[PDB]
Design a protein around this ligand. Sequence first.
Ligand SMILES: CCCc1cc(CNC[C@@H](O)[C@@H]2C[C@H](C)CCCCCCOCC(=O)N(C)[C@@H](C)C(=O)N2)n[nH]1
Length: 373
Amino acid sequence: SFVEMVDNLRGKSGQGYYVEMTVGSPPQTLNILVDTGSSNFAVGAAPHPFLHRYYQRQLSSTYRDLRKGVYVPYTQGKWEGELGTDLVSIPHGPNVTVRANIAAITESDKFFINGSNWEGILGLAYAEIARPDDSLEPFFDSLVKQTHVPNLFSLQLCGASVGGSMIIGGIDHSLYTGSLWYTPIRREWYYEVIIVRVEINGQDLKMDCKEYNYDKSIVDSGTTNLRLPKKVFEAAVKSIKAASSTEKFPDGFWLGEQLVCWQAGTTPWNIFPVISLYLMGEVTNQSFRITILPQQYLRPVEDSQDDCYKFAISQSSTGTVMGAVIMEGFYVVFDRARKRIGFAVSACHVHDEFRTAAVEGPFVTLDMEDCGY
Ligand SMILES: CCCc1cc(CNC[C@@H](O)[C@@H]2C[C@H](C)CCCCCCOCC(=O)N(C)[C@@H](C)C(=O)N2)n[nH]1
């Protein structure tokens, strides 16, 4: 039944993926960013320079005011607003209508993006990280309780402006090739996973695997970059520098600040390494790996005809984040019902002429529990 939802995501590179929703009676139409790294459903509800439209509570007969305040500070950007409920639908989703919590955003700082074309956010993680506290039932929890939609969804994010699919309630088998590989959701707050091994161009980073998950590892469609803990970031960048030392880059390129540009079609893909992340498997001493190409972590940006890119691996102090750059080209199943996350090569996967992004296993990996922090 899922063909209806295929290709229901749009977006600009670096600006997230959104799906179309309606809120209120009569339905008000809004483009809503899909974020697996937060748990609040919130929409613009007041004029803003960057908003093309917004939720108008006064015009919805089914709007109910909860008369509680709310704010969410993300890793970057934040908003505050008023809690309420209203009827919500997803036109290119399941044919259902749910009464859901909505945060009507009244003030924001570094949240809305100039010309981004979305006006709100759909936090698909668990109640445990919802603001103001875990009693605000997240949207997807409301969907499963009030309807027959099965308790899972999948994300196919495609690279470059960009599009993809969010299959709500199941898995669409025409969206991926090969097998799905599953990793346990370590704890139901973020979508937390355990990275057990890291390789760059086949060479093991040889760190205590706890460093990869310090203090957590999450799968986050609302973050653009692969973000790494300080110690792991340094090892990775030192390794990517040595692999690409045939050319010289400003020390501000490795910090994500400056671009790098090449004459179009002359991007030296072969001098940047592939990165392999090994994730804990479903059986004892078993793992699998995802391999990332430079076409994923060198994110294309707008300028000439030179091809320009920003380095989309950045340093973190709140753990590893497998952002949109990692998820591009994979089909990712958020199997909440079975507390696991599946990866497979997407139908829109990233490959150059000599290397290919992959999802391969099984691997044997010893002492995987020691990798949790
Ligand atoms: C109450 C939860 C608190 C909590 C969750 C997280 C982890 N998950 C973070 C994501 O929810 C947000 C979501 C975004 C703010 C949504 C708007 C921007 C969309 C694309 C822009 O991409 C830039 C980027 O990568 N941003 C901004 C990240 C650093 C970032 O903060 N992303 N930390 N804290």
